[PDB]
Design a protein around this nucleic acid. Structure first.
Lengths: 59, 59
DNA sequence: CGTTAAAG
DNA sequence: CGTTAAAG
């Protein structure tokens, strides 16, 4: 379910912008990781590989 | 440094694609979270808010 | 040691 | 910020 380290995302946002982070922001970041991983699976399989690589995460 | 839950990203990729996940893939996912959070800070500040919200993470 | 509760 | 879970 939760694919981001909430404490570290909040520490980064507080330190860089002096701002809080909503529960829903954490949810969007987790869903974003999920979709990157699933599209990374498609890309590695399309190339016949058994490993998702950095080049499979299109950003 | 590491903003993704590595064990859960690897579990997701293994379960969904029967594939391994490279060290460099985890690094790209962490860098992707970092850039989303920093762009989220810019968006919330531009709107004069003290909270990064779901609508500040443009995907 | 990051997450979840709830003491101060 | 101490307690409760569970990632590393």
């Amino acid at each position: 379910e939760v694919l981001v380290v909430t404490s570290k995302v909040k520490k980064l946002i507080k330190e860089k912008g002096q701002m809080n982070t909503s529960a829903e922001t954490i949810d969007v970041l987790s869903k974003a990781i999920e979709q990157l991983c699933l599209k990374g699976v498609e890309s590695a399989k399309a190339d016949g590989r058994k490993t998702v690589m950095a080049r499979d995460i299109v950003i």
